[PDB]
């Protein structure tokens, strides 16, 4: 028969191979989902102002190719996402400037296309004499990889309504053509596909398409026609100057992240370096009782780093679970092999996730997010950005900054874990608020399960569930016997449940945390 091999599939059955691609990458991995992170940033592709689920395998496809460090400062958030994604998955929200626009194709009666572009915020208004429009909802400018539409008529359905085929293809710079999607759609409301679904263009595109969306004009679709067209290309879709983004966009994206229906257990700065956005993210962390890992500008010198911490506004007593880092150093970029400088929040989150993975029953949140075995920084070649400069350790401790050191393998190590609490209590350390927040979240879930119930049931259930949960936490090693046996007994925890009013409950508990080994001293002697 035939020994030929095709490049694209089509409808015939066979095996096809594409031409060899010189410049492309393959990423593989698995989703662990034990902990999730949330962030805010600027990227190259993705629907703006909408929560996106990102995992290790599909991060390149959802977020697009990395941005060049030589152009502005948009390259940092993608590096942070890559660092933080090697442990678990998470969610991001995209912020876009005002100059950005998306392409749109407007048809009319007899099918005469017209091309235009609109800003993201604005809605589409159809002028008199136009039937329908199709626009790209992916939030991806079609500059370097072009996208085209072809329209082919098909057989009428059982009821006699007209139908046609819509096909989407993508072409690269060298001219390689790839097939993306195919659809069978109609211009009549009560039109049904062969498989039994509806063929109305807006409904079909919304239900079963990932890139395209449609808007229809109800005045003229009573008498509208379509003809065979080939390779209609989108034009005008641009990304604005992304090095200049106002604080309004950051605040809007933070508000979007606040009301996300999903659940996450950490918030990452992802290199915003904006005070309003940082304090809004801190408010989110305080609201949901989760951890926070934020960063200050790495290009600052040692002396200027301390005032910026107070400039962030997190210092005080309201935000006791947040942390601030500072990492002035230069490393070789993975993608461009050039010298770049970026932040350190992703490494901290990865260390926290590694600590969490140790215990499978309740989580084991008592492990500090710093250390030689957990918090490791992997960069090609690291040099100080400001040589002939010396840090002051005590000033950093008093101002709540975390230091770095060198491990036994010659790689940089995060060497401290301090939160933004100035009260000098047991609440400096990262693990103590983590324990308390985990216990509180478990209690909230338990109470929510047995809500709206008649009398005589809630008290016993509450006390039994709380005792079992605290026993599990004692077994996991988080709680230990108190250090002062004169003032307190030997019991690691106490509990009490009382009923207050007709429809009110109140429960109080106390527990003793576990210490950490931070500073060790040795003394040599000679005989």
Give the Cα separation of 161 and 224 in Å (integer): 12
Q: Are 205 and 124 in contact (CB under 8 A)?
A: no
* Cβ-contact 294, 281 below 8 angstroms: yes
**Cβ 333 to a copy of itself shortest distance, Å:** 11
Q: How many CB atoms lie within 10 A of CB 469?
A: 18
Q: Is beta strand 37-41 parallel, antiparallel or unpaired with respect to 90-94?
A: parallel
How many residues bind a copy of itself (CB under 8 A)? The answer is 60
Which member of 70, 128, 337, 521 binds a copy of itself (CB under 8 A)?
337
404 lines the binding site for a copy of itself (CB under 8 A) = yes
DSSP for 135-198, written as a single string: EE-S----SSSEEEEEEEE----TT---EEEEEEEEE-SS--EEEEEEEEEESSTT-B-TTS-B
| Minimum gap (Å) between residue 222 Cβ and a copy of itself | 21
- If one counts every other C-beta atom within 10 angstroms of the C-beta of residue 439, the result is 21
**Interacting stretch for a copy of itself, rule CB under 8 A, among 79-87, 229-237, 400-408, 478-486?**
400-408
**Binding to a copy of itself (CB under 8 A): which residues in 81-120?**
none
Cβ proximity to a copy of itself: between 341 and 516 the closer is 341
DSSP string, 318-369: S--SEEEE---EEEE-TTT-SEE----HHHHHHHHHHHHTT-SSS--TTS-S
Gap between the Cα atoms of 325 and 352, Å rounded? 15
Q: Is 454 in the site for a copy of itself (CB under 8 A)?
A: yes
Q: Is residue 10 a contact residue for a copy of itself (CB under 8 A)?
A: yes
List binders of a copy of itself among 144-203 (CB under 8 A).
194, 197-198, 203
CA 196, 202, 207, 209: dihedral to nearest 10 degrees? Answer: 110
Task: Give yes or no for residue 394 binding a copy of itself (CB under 8 A).
Answer: yes
Q: Does 366 bind a copy of itself (CB under 8 A)?
A: yes
Find the DSSP H helices in 345-457: 345-356, 393-398, 431-449
Whole-number Å distance between alpha carbons of 35 and 21: 36
Closest distance between a copy of itself and the C-beta of residue 307, in Å? 34
Closest CA to 362 of 427, 441, 288, 432: 441
Q: Does 403 bind a copy of itself (CB under 8 A)?
A: yes
Nearer of residues 13 and 70 to a copy of itself, judged by Cβ: 13
User: 165 pairs with which residues across the strands?
Assistant: 152, 184
Residues 251-310 that bind a copy of itself (CB under 8 A): 255-256, 258-259, 261
**453 binds a copy of itself per the rule CB under 8 A:** yes
As measured in angstroms, the least distance from the Cβ of 36 to a copy of itself is: 15
Show contacts with a copy of itself in window 199-228 (CB under 8 A). 203, 206-207
* Distance of alpha carbon 117 from alpha carbon 100, whole angstroms: 10
Task: Tell me how far, at minimum, the Cβ of 490 lies from a copy of itself, in Å.
Answer: 35
Cβ-contact 102, 120 below 8 angstroms: yes
The mark string for 31-60 relative to a copy of itself (x by CB under 8 A, - otherwise) is: ------------------------------
Rule CB under 8 A: choose which of 14, 72, 119, 129 binds a copy of itself: 14
Q: Is 407 in the site for a copy of itself (CB under 8 A)?
A: yes
366/431 with CB nearer a copy of itself = 366
> Judged by CB, which is closer to a copy of itself: 3, or 502?
3
**Using CB under 8 A as the criterion, which residues of the chain lie in contact with a copy of itself when the complex forms?**
1-3, 10-14, 194, 197-198, 203, 206-207, 255-256, 258-259, 261, 336-339, 366-368, 370-372, 374, 384, 387-391, 393-394, 396-398, 403-408, 412-413, 415-417, 423, 445, 448-449, 451-454
């Amino acid at each position: 028969s035939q020994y030929s091999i095709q490049q694209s599939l089509g409808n015939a059955s066979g095996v096809a191979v594409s031409p060899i691609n010189a410049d492309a990458t393959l990423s593989t991995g698995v989703a662990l989902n034990s902990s999730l992170w949330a962030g805010i940033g600027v990227f190259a592709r993705g629907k703006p102002f909408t929560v996106l689920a990102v995992t290790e395998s599909n991060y390149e496809d959802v977020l697009g190719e990395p941005l060049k460090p030589s152009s502005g400062s948009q390259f940092e958030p993608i590096r942070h996402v890559y660092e933080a994604i090697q442990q678990t998955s998470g969610y991001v929200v995209r912020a876009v400037p005002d100059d950005a626009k998306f392409p749109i194709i407007m048809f009319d009666e007899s099918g005469e296309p017209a091309y235009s572009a609109l800003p993201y915020g604005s809605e589409i208004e159809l002028d008199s004499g136009e039937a329908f429009a199709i626009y790209v909802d992916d939030g991806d400018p079609c500059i370097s990889p072009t996208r085209e539409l072809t329209i082919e008529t098909a057989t009428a359905d059982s009821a006699g309504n007209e139908r046609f085929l819509l096909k989407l293809t993508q072409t690269t710079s060298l001219g390689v053509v790839t097939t993306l999607e195919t659809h069978t759609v109609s211009l009549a409301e009560e039109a049904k596909d062969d498989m039994g679904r509806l063929c109305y263009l807006p409904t079909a595109l919304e239900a079963r398409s990932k890139y395209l969306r449609a808007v229809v004009n109800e005045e003229l679709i009573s008498t509208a026609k379509v003809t065979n067209k080939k390779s209609l290309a989108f034009t005008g879709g641009t990304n604005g100057d992304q090095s200049k983004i106002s604080t309004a966009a950051y605040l809007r994206a933070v508000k979007v992240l606040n009301n996300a229906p999903y659940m996450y257990t950490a918030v990452l700065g992802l290199g915003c370096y904006d005070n309003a956005a940082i304090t809004a993210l801190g408010k989110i962390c305080a609201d949901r009782l989760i951890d926070g890992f934020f960063d200050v500008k790495p290009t600052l010198t040692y002396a200027e780093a301390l005032p910026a911490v107070e400039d962030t506004g997190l210092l005080g007593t309201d935000y006791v679970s947040c942390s601030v880092y500072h990492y002035p150093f230069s490393c070789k970029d993975k993608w461009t092999q050039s010298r770049v400088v970026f932040g350190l929040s992703g490494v901290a989150y990865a260390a926290k996730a590694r600590g969490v993975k140790k215990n499978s029953d309740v989580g084991g949140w008592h492990y500090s997010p710093a250390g030689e075995e957990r918090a490791v920084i992997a960069r090609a070649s690291i040099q100080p950005l400001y040589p002939e400069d010396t840090p002051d350790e005590e000033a950093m401790v008093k101002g709540r900054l975390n230091k770095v050191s060198v491990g036994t393998s010659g790689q940089m190590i995060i060497d401290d874990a301090l939160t933004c609490c100035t009260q000098d209590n047991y609440l400096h350390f990262q693990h103590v608020p983590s324990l308390m927040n985990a216990i509180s979240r478990f209690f909230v879930q338990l109470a929510r399960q047995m809500k709206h119930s008649p009398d005589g049931i809630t008290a016993a259930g509450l006390t039994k569930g709380m005792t079992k949960l605290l026993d599990r936490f004692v077994a996991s090693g988080a709680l230990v016997a108190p250090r002062d046996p004169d003032a307190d007994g030997t019991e690691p925890y106490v509990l009490k449940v009382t009923q207050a009013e007709f429809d009110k409950w109140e429960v109080v508990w106390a527990c003793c945390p576990t210490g950490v080994a931070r500073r060790i001293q040795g003394v040599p002697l000679l005989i």
